[PDB]
Scaffold this motif. Structure first.
Motif, PDB file in Angstrom:
ATOM      1  N   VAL A   1       0.831  -1.199   0.000  1.00 33.03           N
ATOM      2  CA  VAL A   1       0.000   0.000   0.000  1.00 33.03           C
ATOM      3  C   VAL A   1       0.868   1.252   0.000  1.00 33.03           C
ATOM      4  CG1 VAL A   1      -1.586   1.347   1.417  1.00 33.03           C
ATOM      5  CG2 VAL A   1      -2.037  -1.073   0.989  1.00 33.03           C
ATOM      6  N   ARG A   2       1.930   1.260   0.811  1.00 34.69           N
ATOM      7  CA  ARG A   2       2.803   2.427   0.873  1.00 34.69           C
ATOM      8  C   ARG A   2       3.517   2.670  -0.449  1.00 34.69           C
ATOM      9  NH1 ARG A   2       5.320   1.249   6.948  1.00 34.69           N
ATOM     10  NH2 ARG A   2       3.859   2.603   8.074  1.00 34.69           N
ATOM     11  N   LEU A   3       3.812   1.603  -1.196  1.00 38.57           N
ATOM     12  CA  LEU A   3       4.518   1.756  -2.464  1.00 38.57           C
ATOM     13  C   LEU A   3       3.706   2.585  -3.451  1.00 38.57           C
ATOM     14  CD1 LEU A   3       6.468   1.150  -4.785  1.00 38.57           C
ATOM     15  CD2 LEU A   3       5.452  -1.117  -4.950  1.00 38.57           C
ATOM     16  N   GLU A   4       2.407   2.301  -3.564  1.00 39.19           N
ATOM     17  CA  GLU A   4       1.565   3.079  -4.465  1.00 39.19           C
ATOM     18  C   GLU A   4       1.336   4.486  -3.929  1.00 39.19           C
ATOM     19  OE1 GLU A   4       0.897   1.272  -7.129  1.00 39.19           O
ATOM     20  OE2 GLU A   4       1.461  -0.675  -6.289  1.00 39.19           O
ATOM     21  N   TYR A   5       1.167   4.620  -2.611  1.00 35.71           N
ATOM     22  CA  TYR A   5       0.961   5.939  -2.021  1.00 35.71           C
ATOM     23  C   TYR A   5       2.189   6.821  -2.197  1.00 35.71           C
ATOM     24  CZ  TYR A   5       0.137   9.567   1.460  1.00 35.71           C
ATOM     25  OH  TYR A   5      -0.015  10.775   2.102  1.00 35.71           O
ATOM     26  N   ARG A   6       3.384   6.253  -2.018  1.00 38.78           N
ATOM     27  CA  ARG A   6       4.605   7.022  -2.222  1.00 38.78           C
ATOM     28  C   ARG A   6       4.877   7.291  -3.696  1.00 38.78           C
ATOM     29  NH1 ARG A   6       8.101   3.698  -1.113  1.00 38.78           N
ATOM     30  NH2 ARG A   6       7.187   2.230   0.387  1.00 38.78           N
ATOM     31  N   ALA A   7       4.228   6.558  -4.597  1.00 42.88           N
ATOM     32  CA  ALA A   7       4.363   6.781  -6.028  1.00 42.88           C
ATOM     33  C   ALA A   7       3.322   7.744  -6.577  1.00 42.88           C
ATOM     34  CB  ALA A   7       4.276   5.450  -6.781  1.00 42.88           C
ATOM     35  N   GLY A   8       2.464   8.299  -5.722  1.00 40.30           N
ATOM     36  CA  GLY A   8       1.422   9.201  -6.152  1.00 40.30           C
ATOM     37  C   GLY A   8       0.145   8.532  -6.611  1.00 40.30           C
ATOM     38  N   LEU A   9       0.117   7.202  -6.683  1.00 43.81           N
ATOM     39  CA  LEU A   9      -1.085   6.470  -7.084  1.00 43.81           C
ATOM     40  C   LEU A   9      -1.974   6.253  -5.860  1.00 43.81           C
ATOM     41  CD1 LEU A   9       0.525   3.885  -9.526  1.00 43.81           C
ATOM     42  CD2 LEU A   9      -0.276   6.207  -9.984  1.00 43.81           C
ATOM     43  N   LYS A  10      -2.599   7.349  -5.428  1.00 41.64           N
ATOM     44  CA  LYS A  10      -3.414   7.312  -4.218  1.00 41.64           C
ATOM     45  C   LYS A  10      -4.646   6.435  -4.400  1.00 41.64           C
ATOM     46  CE  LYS A  10      -1.770  11.598  -2.229  1.00 41.64           C
ATOM     47  NZ  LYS A  10      -2.125  12.848  -1.504  1.00 41.64           N
ATOM     48  N   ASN A  11      -5.258   6.464  -5.586  1.00 43.97           N
ATOM     49  CA  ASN A  11      -6.406   5.598  -5.841  1.00 43.97           C
ATOM     50  C   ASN A  11      -6.006   4.128  -5.810  1.00 43.97           C
ATOM     51  OD1 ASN A  11      -8.253   7.790  -6.254  1.00 43.97           O
ATOM     52  ND2 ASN A  11      -7.380   8.069  -8.303  1.00 43.97           N
ATOM     53  N   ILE A  12      -4.884   3.789  -6.447  1.00 44.51           N
ATOM     54  CA  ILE A  12      -4.412   2.408  -6.442  1.00 44.51           C
ATOM     55  C   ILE A  12      -4.025   1.982  -5.033  1.00 44.51           C
ATOM     56  CG2 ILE A  12      -2.647   0.852  -7.330  1.00 44.51           C
ATOM     57  CD1 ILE A  12      -4.918   1.689  -9.266  1.00 44.51           C
ATOM     58  N   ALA A  13      -3.387   2.879  -4.277  1.00 46.77           N
ATOM     59  CA  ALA A  13      -3.037   2.563  -2.896  1.00 46.77           C
ATOM     60  C   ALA A  13      -4.283   2.322  -2.055  1.00 46.77           C
ATOM     61  CB  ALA A  13      -2.196   3.688  -2.296  1.00 46.77           C
ATOM     62  N   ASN A  14      -5.322   3.136  -2.251  1.00 44.87           N
ATOM     63  CA  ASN A  14      -6.559   2.956  -1.498  1.00 44.87           C
ATOM     64  C   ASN A  14      -7.249   1.650  -1.871  1.00 44.87           C
ATOM     65  OD1 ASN A  14      -8.097   3.942   0.569  1.00 44.87           O
ATOM     66  ND2 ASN A  14      -8.916   5.701  -0.559  1.00 44.87           N
TER      67      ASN A  14
END
Lengths: 124, 198, 376, 48, 74, 50
Positions: B41-54
């Motif tokens: 989850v943190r990988l997508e959030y740190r990559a700016g993919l907030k929707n994918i992280a969520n």
RNA sequence: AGCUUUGCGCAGUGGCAGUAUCGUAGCCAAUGAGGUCUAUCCGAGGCGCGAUUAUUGCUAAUU
């Protein structure tokens, strides 16, 4: 016929099974009626699956539910009648969206899982 | 710990898609593990993919619903008006481990509920458990807060607990990096454990 | 260290995107305009999430001077304007200054009274300069947010044509900005949308009914505010539900003409008229004619219980008897003539006192019991 | 009763429209006097 | 063990058979013998489609997981 | 004089706004006070011997 | 083969309350009824009108 925007439409057998499960969930206090309550259940992640009607006019008032289902990884299906769906929920008024909630230890868990498997293999 | 560290290397390497593949393979080999889910989850959030992280966090919470760390990151992954308190209420029903209490105290401190934040910090430290970045967060909050004598009192309690055994230090390394070589002699000995955690 | 450093980047991005917005506004009157609206509506969220951080920083810094003002003034913008106006000198005649525009008169007198006994030390000159710098930055951010809301409100006939018809472009702009986007607005229940823009206003020695609670932008919209105050809650709920429907329609860019919006507005107007409909003619019930014929009434358990309840009781049978020539003593100052009769008096003929009949015990109504159970 | 209640409705409406009739300065003076009196008596506030 | 959607052979010759299904997984079978070789386990959503490059060492499998993955021998 | 005949006909009827309970309430029964009142009144006259 | 969950009937026994029970070709209502508390939260009938010994029948007396 039905609106093509409702592509995951169930056939007669699955419609009957879904309505029976919705009625059983209503009897078990495990159902939420209405699109707003379905949205609330999806946002809280306590929804097994979302059943919504294909006769909603306009259909766009519930087309946001598939997006929330995809975001929250929840199966969803479209039924052909908003009047039979309301009756299954135990309400004489038509219902265009119903949510089956998650209750641990519920005797409907096996039926819910079977319906989820049936729905998730029918969308395409 | 080998999986997540290799994924973090791949993130640092610049090939983030390889990190995604490695984390997916790790989750496949280690099903229903909050530790791999948290890093994914943190990988997508740190990559700016907030929707994918969520979406990945929703999938993670579908499994292992009692994971404290997953819910703790889940509330802070939500907007403050968009059910930041509602998800706190949802998770507090799910479990009561210190990762919950730390997250609730952090949220209360964010809204500047200083009394409630201090009370929940005390509950997290004294009642829940004696390990993790709980003492670091309490010290930071009291440095931000107006407490002065209590600011040193929290440090004294943190020194009283968290001994050289490494149980709390290893959990503190999750956010304080106490397993680093420099931290290997700042307040403990590297030769004792240290390498067990990441 | 971080908020101050990120403030410059936020300001630079806001300025660049505001120049883009001005260019789009000039061009309107391949870089499509929808992306400009999306960028502006994300700017609204960014500005809100920077303004709340600035407000928290000011609240932490100003708490040394006047720690109690945060509770009296919960609104972030009002807090910033108030701490700017008062500054380090609380008793500097600022009470009759611009505060009347910032705050209500009741909360103005409340904050003045609280400042009378502040028990808070003065702030250093560096603390001052930092406080006015933060206040000026927050005011500039608020002005930029107002400009963005004005631009979005100017373009509400395209992004949300249906929702514009119901509540107007201004309320549409406010709800879209506070929700974080049209897509975020659609993925939200009608109950939450009705509370969009609501403020936890402090009640200063008043009931929570006087300070309208759980009321947002929709409650203060033109159509909702046009109803009498006794019907404005139902009006707000209905308008919020229809606005949620319109937003869900709008997020899919359907009924761009506004047919859904016009139908929903017509339905809302019809419901409002029905609520305003004059009461119907109701027949007067004449008095029943006196009757002397015999009427047969059933017996049984119910009749037995009613007879037991209404029937004369030994405690009341004895209290109805007054001795002849036994002049008693007054036992109740507030009402003379009142007497217990033969109760606990000589000549009653009973050595032992009569017991209380439990069938006459006081009990509450079934509906009242239901209300008490609900209150628990 | 009807006349007095109409007058009372008018009075409450005027109070709501004209705001509080006690200015801040008078309220500050009254509150300061009360606070000083309570401190002089060493009064302990009644708890919940 | 779920609805099969994508079935594709090696583009060059009958080297193998690639299958994909709603079981969020893909499998490889010898084209003559029809015996499993490697299960392309992974993904978290139903594998809608797949394709093999003309070179034959590239395998792509899109899925309901909003992601597509590539497979090469290592 | 200028009130048109259509306006004269279109005058609405007066309808009461009170509901059924307000207009025609059910008969309100009167009941005797509970015996506890007499018991407490007679207990009031009792006095200690010390 | 037993066991057991839910809903619907049909009966039996028992307990409780008669300031309440019904009627709705009246109206509104999950496309959200209704919200004093918990409100980016709650989720179901509400209202108007009508019936009445505050559900309605027989039976026994006096008549």
């Amino acid at each position: 016929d039905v609106n093509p925007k409702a592509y995951p439409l169930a056939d007669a057998h699955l419609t009957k099974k879904l309505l029976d499960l919705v009625q059983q969930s209503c009897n078990y206090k495990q159902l939420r009626k209405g699109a707003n309550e379905a949205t609330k259940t999806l946002n809280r992640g306590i929804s097994e699956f979302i059943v919504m009607a294909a006769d909603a006019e306009p259909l766009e008032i519930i087309l946001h539910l598939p997006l929330l289902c995809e975001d929250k990884n929840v199966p969803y299906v479209f039924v052909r009648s908003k009047q039979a769906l309301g009756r299954a929920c135990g309400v004489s008024r038509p219902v265009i969206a119903c949510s089956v909630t998650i209750k641990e230890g519920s005797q409907l868990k096996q039926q819910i899982q079977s319906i989820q498997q049936s729905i998730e293999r029918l969308l395409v | 710990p080998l999986w997540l560290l290799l994924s973090r290397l791949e993130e640092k390497i610049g090939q983030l898609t390889r990190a995604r593949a490695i984390l997916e393979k790790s989750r496949l080999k280690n099903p229903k593990n909050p530790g791999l889910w948290l890093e994914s989850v943190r990988l997508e959030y740190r990559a700016g993919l907030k929707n994918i992280a969520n979406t990945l966090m929703a999938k993670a919470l579908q499994e292992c619903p009692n994971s404290g760390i997953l819910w703790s990151e889940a509330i802070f992954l939500e907007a403050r008006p968009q059910r930041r308190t509602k998800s706190v209420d949802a998770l507090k029903k799910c479990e009561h481990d210190p990762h919950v209490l730390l997250a609730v105290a952090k949220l209360f401190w964010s809204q500047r509920k200083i009394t409630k934040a201090r009370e929940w910090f005390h509950r997290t430290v004294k009642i829940d458990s004696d390990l993790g970045d709980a003492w670091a967060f309490f010290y930071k909050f009291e440095l931000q807060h107006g407490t002065e004598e209590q600011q040193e009192e929290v440090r004294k309690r943190c020194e009283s607990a968290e001994p050289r055994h490494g149980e709390l230090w290893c959990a503190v390394s999750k956010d304080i990096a106490n397993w680093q070589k420099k931290i290997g002699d700042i307040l403990r000995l590297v030769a004792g454990r240290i390498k067990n955690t990441f | 260290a971080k908020l101050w450093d990120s403030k410059m980047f936020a300001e630079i991005m806001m300025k660049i995107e505001e120049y883009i917005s001005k260019q789009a506004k000039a061009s309107e009157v391949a870089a499509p305009e929808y992306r400009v609206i999306v960028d502006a509506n994300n700017l609204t969220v960014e500005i809100e999430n920077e303004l709340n951080i600035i407000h928290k920083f000011i609240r932490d810094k100003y708490s040394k001077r006047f720690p109690e003002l945060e509770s009296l003034v919960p609104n972030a913008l009002d807090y910033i304007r108030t701490v700017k106006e008062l500054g380090n000198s609380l008793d500097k005649c600022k009470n009759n200054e611009n505060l009347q525009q910032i705050l209500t008169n009741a909360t103005i007198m409340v904050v003045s009274v609280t400042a009378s006994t502040t028990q808070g030390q003065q702030l250093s000159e560096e603390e001052l300069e930092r406080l006015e710098e933060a206040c000026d930055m927050a005011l500039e951010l608020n002005a930029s947010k107002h400009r963005i809301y004005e631009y979005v409100e100017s373009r509400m006939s395209f992004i949300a044509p249906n929702l514009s018809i119901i509540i107007g472009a201004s309320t549409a702009a406010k709800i879209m900005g506070v929700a974080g986007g049209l897509t975020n607005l659609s993925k939200m229940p009608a109950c939450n949308i009705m509370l969009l823009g609501a403020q936890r206003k402090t009640l200063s020695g008043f009931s929570s009914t006087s300070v309208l609670p759980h009321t947002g932008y929709i409650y203060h919209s033109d159509i909702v505010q046009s109803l009498p105050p006794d019907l404005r809650r139902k009006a707000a709920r209905l308008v919020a539900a229809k606005c949620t429907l319109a937003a869900r329609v709008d997020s899919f860019h359907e009924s761009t003409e506004g047919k859904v919006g016009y139908e929903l507005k017509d339905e809302i107007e019809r419901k409002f008229d029905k609520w305003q409909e004059p009461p119907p003619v109701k027949q007067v019930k004449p008095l029943p004619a006196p009757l002397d014929g015999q009427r047969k009434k059933r017996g049984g358990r119910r009749y037995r219980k009613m007879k037991e309840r209404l029937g004369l009781t030994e405690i009341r049978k004895q209290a109805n008897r007054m001795s002849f020539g036994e002049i008693e003593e007054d036992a109740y100052q507030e009402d003379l003539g009142f007497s217990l009769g033969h109760l606990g008096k000589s000549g009653s003929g009973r050595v032992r006192q009569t017991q209380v009949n439990e069938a006459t015990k006081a009990r509450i109504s079934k509906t009242l019991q239901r209300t008490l159970q609900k209150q628990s | 009763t009807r006349l007095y209640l109409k007058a009372e409705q008018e009075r409450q409406h005027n109070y709501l429209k004209d705001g509080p009739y006690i200015t801040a300065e008078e309220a500050v003076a009254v509150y300061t006097t009360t606070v000083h009196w309570l401190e002089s008596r060493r009064f302990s506030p009644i708890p919940f | 063990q779920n609805l099969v959607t994508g079935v594709k052979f090696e583009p060059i010759h009958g080297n193998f058979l690639l299958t994909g299904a709603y079981d969020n997984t893909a499998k490889i079978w010898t084209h003559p013998g029809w015996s499993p070789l490697k299960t392309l386990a992974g993904h978290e959503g139903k594998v809608m489609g797949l394709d093999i490059s003309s070179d034959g060492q590239l395998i792509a499998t899109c899925s309901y997981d909003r992601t597509f993955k590539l497979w090469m021998a290592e | 004089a200028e009130v048109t005949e259509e306006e004269w006909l279109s005058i609405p009827e007066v309808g009461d706004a009170r509901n059924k309970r307000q207009r025609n309430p059910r008969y309100e029964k009167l009941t005797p006070v509970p015996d506890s009142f007499f018991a407490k009144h007679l207990q009031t006259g009792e006095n200690h011997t010390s």
